């Protein structure tokens, strides 16, 4: 829905890599609006366990499992552009 926003000046000064910047993306960058009903916001039911959802999750997870070996052979520039394409397709869907 929206990208995380980093207010931190040292983090904005230094962070460059993919995960090394992503570890600085916290809940306070827009997601944590006011925070008084957090315990109700994290008590969760598990009614998704159905037939077609579980097989779709399994087939896509194994697809990722089989292709993630080429992901580590990518460069920083690739990872950023590929994940931008993935985010654009995800909001499209």
């Amino acid at each position: 829905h929206k990208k995380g926003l980093v207010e931190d000046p040292i983090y904005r000064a230094t962070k460059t890599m993919f995960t090394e910047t992503l570890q600085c993306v916290n809940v306070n960058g827009g997601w944590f609006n006011y925070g008084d009903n957090i315990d109700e916001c994290y008590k969760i039911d598990t009614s998704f366990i159905t037939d077609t959802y579980v097989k779709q999750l399994n087939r896509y997870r194994k697809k990722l499992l089989a292709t993630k070996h080429i992901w580590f052979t990518l460069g920083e520039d690739q990872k950023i552009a590929i994940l931008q394409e993935c985010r654009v397709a995800l909001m499209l869907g």
């Binding site: 931190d8 000046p9 040292i10 983090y11 000064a13 230094t14 600085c24």
Partner: protein
């Protein structure tokens, strides 16, 4: 790519105003460079330069004489003379509200950097003076030169120190060009052969006579280059600005 943390409105009182034998007033840049390396030691954040400005500063005393300190009988062996007043050695005292801006290089979040600087400043002592109060320090970064000026203008309001150099000597130009003199460092005279009465026995010690440079006070926004206000330890047993002599 530069990173700074600014502590604004550092109200400090009890400052040892005796900068040297011939300078009494604002503490020199050797004091604030010493404060910077003090945090490099206690907090571990290694500090290149410090830009310090004076919001307020009053030397205790009149316009021609400083208020001397009533000494206490603290030496050993002069009991019996303790009923009379202790003799006064000259140490002027002063109060000062300062604004400090430390060049640091940091790799963690700004909150733990602010907390480390706050925990240092709560146990620090500006020029022998107890830090009465200080605002919460804030981190600002100088990516480019416009960002350097952003950090510069974030110390408003304060009168920072810019180096204007020595032409012939200190007294002559202080009358002629009317600039202020202060300790930019020290000159080593003799090696000290007795380390028994010192802080460390292994750190090499020298008797020193303070060298002085001539400086001016300019408001931090009116300073064109922030490197001319950031004092740092130069390799001539002195301190110096990054931008050199202010023109």
């Amino acid at each position: 790519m530069r990173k700074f943390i600014i502590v604004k409105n550092v109200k400090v009182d009890g400052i040892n105003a005796k900068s040297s034998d011939i300078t009494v007033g604002m503490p020199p840049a050797t004091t604030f460079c010493g404060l910077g390396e003090t945090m490099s030691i206690k907090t571990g954040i290694v500090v290149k330069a410090v830009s310090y400005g004076s919001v307020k500063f009053e030397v205790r005393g009149s316009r021609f004489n400083t208020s001397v300190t009533k000494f206490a009988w603290q030496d050993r062996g002069n009991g019996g003379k303790a009923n009379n007043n202790s003799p006064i050695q000259p140490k002027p005292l002063a109060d000062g509200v300062f604004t400090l801006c430390f060049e640091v290089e940091w790799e963690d979040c700004a909150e733990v950097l602010v907390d480390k600087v706050t925990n240092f400043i709560n146990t620090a002592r500006i020029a022998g003076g107890t830090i009465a109060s200080f605002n919460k320090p804030f981190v600002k970064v100088a990516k480019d030169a416009e960002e350097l000026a952003s950090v510069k203008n974030a110390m408003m309001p304060c009168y920072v120190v810019v180096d204007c150099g020595v032409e012939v000597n200190i007294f002559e130009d202080a009358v002629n060009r009317k600039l202020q003199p202060m300790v930019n460092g020290y000159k080593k005279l003799e090696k000290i052969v007795d380390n028994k009465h010192m802080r460390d026995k292994f750190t090499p010690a020298y008797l020193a006579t303070p060298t002085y440079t001539m400086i001016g006070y300019k408001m931090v926004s009116n300073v064109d280059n922030f490197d001319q206000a950031l004092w740092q330890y130069g390799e001539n047993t002195k301190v110096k600005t990054i931008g050199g002599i202010y023109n």
